[PDB]
Amino acid sequence: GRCLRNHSITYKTPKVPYERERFDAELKLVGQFGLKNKKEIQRVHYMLGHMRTIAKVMLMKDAKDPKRLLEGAALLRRLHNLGILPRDQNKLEFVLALKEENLLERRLQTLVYRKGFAKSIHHARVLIRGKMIKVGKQVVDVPSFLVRVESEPLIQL
């Protein structure tokens, strides 16, 4: 190693470069969310895969294991504020049943749509990128803001 500041990769490329069954499924979401390219799909897929790996590893231990109680609640707690997982589902098994639409539907470009500020999801980018939008007390212009539950009713022009 040479540098002291850490760095990381936000996404991974698919193993099979050429599939028709994947080009349509990935282009279904691009139109449904106005994403710039295929990096956003991979990043969201990469994000979910990390949580699924924690629950997958943790389901192999006993319920009275000290690490299961502490780490298990930590993952469910984190998801609850983010709002990916519904509150009434409070078991690690429901983590594995999450999909890639749960994470993408909490993005800022998605949130400003369903709240009604942006007519079209392509129109949301210009408003978001133009700093027209505000989250509580801070101006935001990154369309990838994964809003939490508390900040859901705090999205205004």
Next chain:
Amino acid sequence: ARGLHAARKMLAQRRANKWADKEWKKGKLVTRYKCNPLGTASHAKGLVQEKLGIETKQPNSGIRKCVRVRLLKNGKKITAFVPRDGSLNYVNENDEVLISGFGRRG
């Protein structure tokens, strides 16, 4: 030798049998620095001293143009293909040419 204490033979069997690997042995024994005209280099710089036309193999007919190139490190002579169509015209003699393998690993 599957026994519990039989890790000495289980290890000596694998050391010997790995030398039969045609590919693993190649990158370990000392000929890459002597027999290989490139060494561990990705490319190589050389000088042109002859332009060659190689007749194709049996199921083809034609003349694949080529050159004879002497490197600067080893000093050996190697026959180098000309990449694209009509690219023999742009080649000359006593000039630097970069030489980088082919699709297959040497």
Next chain:
Amino acid sequence: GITRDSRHKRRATGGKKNSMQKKKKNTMGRQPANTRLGAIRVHDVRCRYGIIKRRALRLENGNFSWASQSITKGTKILNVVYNASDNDFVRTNTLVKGAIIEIDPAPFLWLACISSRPGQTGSVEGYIL
């Protein structure tokens, strides 16, 4: 200079040792100073950490002690008559620990074996057999 490391010796299996580093002052050795018999002469060697070793080059007198009579008296050494290690020490009358030396009992009025390190402490001290 003389060295005292084990990097120059063979292994317990007889295999030669392959060097890695040059000589170092920690394992420094020094020339012997065979304290012969003669006039008084010592030299102060500046050892490691600044400490000073009295290097007796030639000596004539020593403070011999008698165990039976509980008396220690200075005396002039006469002749080195026996050395348990090297008989060539007897010929040159070199004074080392354990050398059997005969002395004149002039203050004893009131055979010896040395029991000090003249090359380290700087003087001869012994006892009477």
Next chain:
Amino acid sequence: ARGPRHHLKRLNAPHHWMLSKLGGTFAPKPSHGPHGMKECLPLILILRNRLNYALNGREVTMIVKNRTIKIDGKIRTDTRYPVGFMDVLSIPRTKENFRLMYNTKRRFCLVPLTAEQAKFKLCKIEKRVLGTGAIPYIVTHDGRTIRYPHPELQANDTIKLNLETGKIVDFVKFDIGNTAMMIGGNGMGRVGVIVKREVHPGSFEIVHIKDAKGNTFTTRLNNVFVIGKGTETLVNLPLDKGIKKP
């Protein structure tokens, strides 16, 4: 290296100083004295981070050299003086008397004290030896060689010291009915009661310490530091009262 070192790289510094990994290349090497390298907090770190009086080392030398710090009864003017265990630290200008005790997070903590309780400080005997001329003496955990001691002050007791006078006020033996604070590894910064000390002739002496809440944890005899007698503490314990939450 041909001799003793002088610099200290940031990452080689003891972990319990909590120095930012991107703060800088080097860390303040604590000069020698009473407390070891890894058992002490340098006086610069006490003021720059723990108390935030000085932002950088420019303003730390402007303070310690200004005769504005009194480590124990005496006054120290070394920027990197080794400030270790419960040795008291006092600032007359701001009128505050801290103290460096441990806590459950393996960290040195500055427990506030009053003026009266800052006049004394507990020490732990390390060894007792007979000097030349039959002048016995004892050595505390602070490296202090106290003069003619009490005859019963044995190797692993705890004594009470006075800053103004320098005498020995009270002394606590090492038995199975005393309160001890921990200066060790996993058990570091924990208060408890000595209940059992099993002896192995070979290497180490192992002491079982029972916590207030009934938790039992063992340790090495070295890390034991008697703090009182009969489930009583002679000093104000830190905020967490030496208790560990699982």
Next chain:
Amino acid sequence: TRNLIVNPLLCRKQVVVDIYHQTIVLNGFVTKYGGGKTSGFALIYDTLSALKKFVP
């Protein structure tokens, strides 16, 4: 503003000035994105001698 620390030894006060839009030290200021609110540290040395001597 924010946290204030009283420093008698350095004869100064360390206060984190929040801007909600020869005896003082104004440094360490970083705004937010696109302007607006700005934070910083305010140091007051009262005596001019302090600024005359207590400055790197």
Next chain:
RNA sequence: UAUCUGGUUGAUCCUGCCAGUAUUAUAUGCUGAUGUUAAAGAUUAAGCCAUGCAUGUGUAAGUAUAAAGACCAAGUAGGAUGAAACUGCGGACGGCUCAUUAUAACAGUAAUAGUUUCUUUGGUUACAAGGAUAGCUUUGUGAAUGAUAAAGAUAAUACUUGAGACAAUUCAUUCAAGUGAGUUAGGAUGCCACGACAAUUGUAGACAAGUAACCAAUGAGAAUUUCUGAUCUAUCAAUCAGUUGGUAGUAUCGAGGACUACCAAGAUUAUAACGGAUAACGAGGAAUUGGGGUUCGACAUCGGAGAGGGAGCUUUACAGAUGGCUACCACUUCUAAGGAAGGCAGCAGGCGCGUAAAUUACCCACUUUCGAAUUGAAGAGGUAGUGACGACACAUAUUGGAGGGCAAGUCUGGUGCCAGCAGCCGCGGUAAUUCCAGCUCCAAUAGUGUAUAUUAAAGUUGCUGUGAUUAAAACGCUCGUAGUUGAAUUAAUUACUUUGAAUAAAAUAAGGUGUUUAAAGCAAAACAUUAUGUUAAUGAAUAUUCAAGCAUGGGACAAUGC
């Protein structure tokens, strides 16, 4: 994501390989809006270097009439300040590199009852003497170095004598309490060597300051040493003679064949000794991984070694120092031709080498170190410049391809087995879906191909896990040592298993925290709408971590003799 597809045939099922694919690190082609972060002469030559800097240091407390003190300010023992010089401290840290090195070093672990300084901390122990010396003056030489000669003086916390009155070292004898364990700390007797607490300093910040030894700390430190652990090779099977042990001595800070004298014949080896290879510095760690693993680690941090090659030494507490000296070997520089210095594997920079790698910039303000000490220095460190090595967020355009593998043209011109394309099968001999073109569209996107190498694919190196009738592959057969494996049974150690103890950080997983999110960082803020308190705020228990080592609960499965 525990994944495969094309290619042997007229066709089918196999073994089997080639090609395809994804990822990491090096170069390179084409192209390039932003903001954050960031590697960068290691591979080839530890090859050679012009030039500039990288180590100096002064407080009231060592010596100062400098003819310096009109610049504060006066001055009769010298006013506060003081260039230079002596004296003290330092350049043994830091910084660079990876040639040497195969039980050596290194990692964990244990010992030092076998050694130990420096700095720092606690403590103990004659109202004042003597010479000479620099800066200073004067006379000089040589081309010259950080060049050196005589004479005239003048100081000490430089060099000595001397008192105010013990300690520690050697030897011989003796009495003897902590510790697992000591003829041990310690005391007593007798001579020997050494023998002090400056013959010291502020008039102002009696109180500091300073000094000489000796005990204890700093020391978990340093240095030696115990146990376990390393890649390939038998076209390396026997190796060693200070070698193995003993006694006496020598030397060392100290154990010790470390060395010397005498005596004995011993020590290692199929559990791989001895030797050979390395494009070998070791570890923390990195890449990739369902599990098991494979490859890598010069390079943040720790340990080792070196300064062109050996050798030998001085100074001091520590150097076998090389930004110290001497000689030899090999180079480079100045020259008045007589002579003289130099060691960029320090920071920039140059030549060479190669596929392959940045400014002859600014500043000690952050971190820290050095110093006579708050003030000076630091090419350490920070800032700035180059920087499609990489990583993160984010505008509105290129790269490669269009038979199959593999998403994309039964579109139009020439060529006619020629040019050519083509990783593999293959396409082209006049009607080319592949050539060179034009239009159209496929994939990725500020990125996209190529070449080489590592990992997965590879159950094509098999412990989990392969194959041996016929595809490659059971010795011609028997005996046999080492090795591996060994029936049932019982109402002192080891191995096994469970808990801990102890255990550098960074890194990995991870807890919290809205850097506009993210990479990041360990910061901050819900809040007191804030000086007040939440607040003595958070610091992940951060878990680990293999092979050894310590202790403990258990005795079924195993091992060693009685």
Next chain:
RNA sequence: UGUACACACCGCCCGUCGCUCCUACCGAUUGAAUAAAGAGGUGAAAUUCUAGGAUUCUGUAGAA
């Protein structure tokens, strides 16, 4: 029924000899050299011991 044939026996295919190119191996021969670790001879240099004592200090005695 056998097949090594599938353009299917007008199939396929072996070996010497002849042409061009390429790679490794041996090698009378000045062949043959270069760079790396031991035995004997010569052996600079600095340290240890010994002799010396130019000079200068106390006024030849002694010290350096």
